Amino acid sequence: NGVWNGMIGEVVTKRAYMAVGSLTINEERSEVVDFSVPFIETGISVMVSRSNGSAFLEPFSADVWVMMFVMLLIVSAVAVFVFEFTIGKAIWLLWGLVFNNSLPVQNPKGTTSKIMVSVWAFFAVIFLASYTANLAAFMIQRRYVDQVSGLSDKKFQRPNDFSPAFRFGTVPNGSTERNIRNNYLEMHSYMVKFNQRSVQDALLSLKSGKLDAFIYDAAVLNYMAGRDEGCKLVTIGSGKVFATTGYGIAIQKDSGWKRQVDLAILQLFGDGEMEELEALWLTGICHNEKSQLDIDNMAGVFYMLAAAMALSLITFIMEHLFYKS
Amino acid sequence: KAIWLLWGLVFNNSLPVQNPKGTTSKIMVSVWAFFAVIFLASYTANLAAFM
Amino acid sequence: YVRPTTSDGTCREEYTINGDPIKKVICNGPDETIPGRPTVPQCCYGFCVDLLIKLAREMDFTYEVHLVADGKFGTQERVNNSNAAAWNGMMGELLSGQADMIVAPLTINNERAQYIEFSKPFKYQGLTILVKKEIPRDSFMQ
Amino acid sequence: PFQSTLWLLVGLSVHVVAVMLYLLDRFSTLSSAMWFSWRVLLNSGLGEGAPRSFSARILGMVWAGFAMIIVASYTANLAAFLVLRRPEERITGINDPRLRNPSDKFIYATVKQSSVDIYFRRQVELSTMYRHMEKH
Amino acid sequence: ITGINDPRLRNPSDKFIYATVKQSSVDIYFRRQVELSTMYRHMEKHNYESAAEAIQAVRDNKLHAFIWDSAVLEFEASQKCDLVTTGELFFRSGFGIGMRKDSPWKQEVSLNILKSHENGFMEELDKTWVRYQECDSRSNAPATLTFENMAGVFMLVAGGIVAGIFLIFIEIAYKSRAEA
Ligand SMILES: *[C@@H]1O[C@H](CO)[C@@H](O)[C@H](O)[C@H]1NC(C)=O
Numbered sequence: 101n102g103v104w105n106g107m108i109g110e111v112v113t114k115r116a117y118m119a120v121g122s123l124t125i126n127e128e129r130s131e132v133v134d135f136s137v138p139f140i141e142t143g144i145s146v147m148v149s150r151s152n153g154s155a156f157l158e159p160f161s162a163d164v165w166v167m168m169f170v171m172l173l174i175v176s177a178v179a180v181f182v183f184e185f186t187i188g189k190a191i192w193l194l195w196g197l198v199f200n201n202s203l204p205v206q207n208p209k210g211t212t213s214k215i216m217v218s219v220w221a222f223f224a225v226i227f228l229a230s231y232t233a234n235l236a237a238f239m240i241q242r243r244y245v246d247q248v249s250g251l252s253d254k255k256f257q258r259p260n261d262f263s264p265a266f267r268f269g270t271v272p273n274g275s276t277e278r279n280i281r282n283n284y285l286e287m288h289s290y291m292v293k294f295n296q297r298s299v300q301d302a303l304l305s306l307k308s309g310k311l312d313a314f315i316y317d318a319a320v321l322n323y324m325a326g327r328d329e330g331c332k333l334v335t336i337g338s339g340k341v342f343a344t345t346g347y348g349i350a351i352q353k354d355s356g357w358k359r360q361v362d363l364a365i366l367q368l369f370g371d372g373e374m375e376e377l378e379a380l381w382l383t384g385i386c387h388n389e390k391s392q393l394d395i396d397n398m399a400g401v402f403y404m405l406a407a408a409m410a411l412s413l414i415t416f417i418m419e420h421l422f423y424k425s
Numbered sequence: 426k427a428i429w430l431l432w433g434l435v436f437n438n439s440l441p442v443q444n445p446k447g448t449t450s451k452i453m454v455s456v457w458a459f460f461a462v463i464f465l466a467s468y469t470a471n472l473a474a475f476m
Numbered sequence: 477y478v479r480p481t482t483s484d485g486t487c488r489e490e491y492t493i494n495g496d497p498i499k500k501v502i503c504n505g506p507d508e509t510i511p512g513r514p515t516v517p518q519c520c521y522g523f524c525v526d527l528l529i530k531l532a533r534e535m536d537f538t539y540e541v542h543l544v545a546d547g548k549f550g551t552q553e554r555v556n557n558s559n560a561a562a563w564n565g566m567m568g569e570l571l572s573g574q575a576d577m578i579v580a581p582l583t584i585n586n587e588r589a590q591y592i593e594f595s596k597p598f599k600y601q602g603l604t605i606l607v608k609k610e611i612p613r614d615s616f617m618q
Numbered sequence: 619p620f621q622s623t624l625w626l627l628v629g630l631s632v633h634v635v636a637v638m639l640y641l642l643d644r645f646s647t648l649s650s651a652m653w654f655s656w657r658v659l660l661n662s663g664l665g666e667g668a669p670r671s672f673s674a675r676i677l678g679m680v681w682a683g684f685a686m687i688i689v690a691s692y693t694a695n696l697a698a699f700l701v702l703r704r705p706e707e708r709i710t711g712i713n714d715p716r717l718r719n720p721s722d723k724f725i726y727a728t729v730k731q732s733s734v735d736i737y738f739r740r741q742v743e744l745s746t747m748y749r750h751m752e753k754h
Numbered sequence: 755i756t757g758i759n760d761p762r763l764r765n766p767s768d769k770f771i772y773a774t775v776k777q778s779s780v781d782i783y784f785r786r787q788v789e790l791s792t793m794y795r796h797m798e799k800h801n802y803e804s805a806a807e808a809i810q811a812v813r814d815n816k817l818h819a820f821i822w823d824s825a826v827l828e829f830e831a832s833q834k835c836d837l838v839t840t841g842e843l844f845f846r847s848g849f850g851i852g853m854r855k856d857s858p859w860k861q862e863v864s865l866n867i868l869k870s871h872e873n874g875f876m877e878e879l880d881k882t883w884v885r886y887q888e889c890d891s892r893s894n895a896p897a898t899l900t901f902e903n904m905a906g907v908f909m910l911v912a913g914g915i916v917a918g919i920f921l922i923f924i925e926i927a928y929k930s931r932a933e934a
């Protein structure tokens with residue numbers, strides 16, 4: 101309403117000259133009290149579990165398909181020549197033989213087709229081996245891109261657009277919550293239900309389930325990313341935070357030790373102490389590593405196959421248009 | 426003979442002959458085939474893992 | 477970014493990857509193109525420029541920009557007696573008043589900080605090293 | 619490797635395809651297509667039947683490609699299986715933040731009056747960390 | 755380069771250069787700081803005058819390594835991807851607009867800067883001016899590429915097919931001849 105609360109009150113009441121802590125910075129407080137320069141890179145951020153939302157299809161490197169076309173040309177020519185709808189059948193067999201054999205019909209008697217089949221078979225084992233190995237390699241070596249890639253995607257903006265209810269919350273009476281209410285109303289009005297008592301408890305809502313995503317200060321979320329009983333929690337994207345800010349320190353007004361403080365601060369990094377202090381206090385053991393049961397991307401390719409089946413229906417329709425001709 | 430076919434089906438197929446007509450054999454063949462594909466995947470994966 | 481204004485004509489309608497026309501402003505700065513170095517009228521467009529004009533719409537002020545003669549931003553230097561001269565570069569222009577305000581990518585440090593006031597950081601970044609990536613890792617035989 | 623949600627759906631669509639194929643055949647059979655789906659999927663090659671039709675042929679080729687993709691999924695998951703070590707369980711260095719981030723919950727134990735304790739007491743540089751070692 | 759503290763830096767070499775700009779603020783970090791004061795001198799050798807030349811040396815491969823603050827560097831890292839940034843930003847700092855202490859307009863400026871941060875204005879501006887288009891972490895993600903690599907196997911198989919053509923020709927001549 102009309103009145104301020106917290107340490108800032110004791111700074112205003114002159115019960116505190118300077119206030120120190122994890123306090124974030126904002127325009128209002130900078131207006132009322134002079135702030136120290138930011139010592140650490142921080143801000144609003146997200147902390148979520150490893151839900152991933154056809155990187156297996158991608159190992160093709162756009163080559164497997166192109167190869168398939170080239171293969172088509174080679175098969176067609178070879179089949180047409182060798183014997184010295186049926187051709188299409190023979191190349192159906194060759195195409196089957198390409199992928200893990202599994203083609204029922206009629207290897208052509210013609211001799212050249214046999215040798216060509218042998219070479220093609222070597223090519224096929226090569227196709228299986230290459231595709232599978234690259235797939236396994238992607239099963240290894242993955243950056244694991246996450247839920248909101250845009251991060252402004254508005255999936256956050258409305259839960260209701262997504263049929264299952266989504267969930268995200270933050271600690272109230274925060275600079276984060278006030279900022280949210282200032283810029284994004286709907287998010288605030290929706291998230292009030294998902295607001296949590298304390299960071300350990302907010303963590304309880306994330307950790308035990310019953311909540312998907314958690315949002316909080318970036319330094320705390322990064323340290324918590326590094327420090328967890330198991331490495332079950334990670335940051336969002338590169339943890340690159342919007343509302344880029346740093347922790348400041350209160351003073352009264354234009355009259356203060358002021359600049360003298362500021363100099364001291366950059367002497368601290370100036371001697372490189374902050375890196376040491378970062379390794380001791382801030383550095384977490386986790387996130388050194390960067391691991392799950394298969395997820396949605398396989399479902400995507402699976403859907404792609406379904407869509408291709410639709411294409412079989414379209415080719416059936418084209419064939420029907422053709423039959424009249 | 427039938428088990429020669431089943432054994433072939435066990436390792437990467439590559440066996441020519443005569444899947445038995447008997448209906449039950451189709452289902453038994455299906456379950457066993459699943460076991461066999463599990464065997465191929467496991468063997469190849471374990472080989473790569475030891476690599 | 478620096479490009480000269482084409483003849484008398486001012487600035488290109490060149491567009492950002494997100495469809496927007498690129499904004500631009502005139503800046504007088506050092507030119508190495510001529511054998512002698514003239515302070516040359518130029519066109520400059522930037523992140524800091526968009527920020528500056530953003531402020532200019534927000535702030536009562538009007539802006540005229542010229543790039544500092546020295547390629548360096550600034551560093552303390554020269555003569556021994558008393559404390560003599562002043563740090564060469566745009567910062568030196570700021571104390572001198574050649575420019576009343578400095579808009580550039582300037583890191584913020586205490587040694588400089590005592591001399592001048594510093595605006596809250598628009599950006600947060602730290603030093604790092606650039607080295608070429610490419611050392612590879614080609615036949616089915618391999 | 620494949621969640622039962624993944625696994626059931628693949629079978630449902632398996633039938634849903636063999637049937638679309640079968641149905642395609644019947645419309646313009648049940649045993650033929652069901653066994654065709656399973657045969658095409660498993661490389662069983664019952665060889666009893668194949669559809670001549672373009673729709674059917676294309677669906678089958680895409681189907682086989684999908685079989686290759688599924689065997690690939692078994693392999694990917696097995697590869698995911700191969701990462702034996704979890705991110706945790708290591709004390710990274712002589713100076714470990716897990717020590718630096720002490721916890722009442724996570725004990726770090728030593729013997730009092732052991733020479734190590736003398737290392738903790740005599741040394742100023744790690745002297746803070748000493749208390750975490752000193753306790754209990 | 756393993757870290758801000760790199761044994762490779764710590765183990766300097768005339769053979770392995772590490773390059774910077776004299777009078778760049780980094781140099782002020784080297785001179786002002788006592789703790790690394792020894793390490794400064796190795797950097798002092800073979801300094802470049804400007805940013806473009808410094809990036810170019812690494813690109814030209816004249817100099818094996820280049821040291822500068824990330825904000826200028828990462829954008830370039832995106833720009834080429836032939837070159838990469840490594841390790842953790844050290845000397846963590848920020849970029850700001852200079853004014854004399856006596857001028858009160860700066861009071862508004864910071865007040866404005868913060869107001870520009872909260873709305874995500876900066877985020878969108880960095881998003882515009884940092885392209886991010888083409889590059890990745892190089893070590894582990896070859897798999898996106900590899901079309902050419904497969905081609906290096908497949909072309910051989912195909913050459914096998916061309917052999918198939920010669921063999922076929924031989925069979926065709928020899929067979930009709932064989933039973934003639
Ligand atoms: C936040 O403050 C309001 C009153 O200002 C209070 O009713 C509410 O319970 C507080 N929430 C927490 C988590 O402290």
Ligand SMILES: N[C@]1(C(=O)O)C[C@@H](C(=O)O)C1
Pocket residue numbers: 122123124125271272273274275276277316317
């Ligand atoms: N540092 C915070 C502040 O109010 O200054 C607490 C934190 C949060 O609630 O996310 C921001």
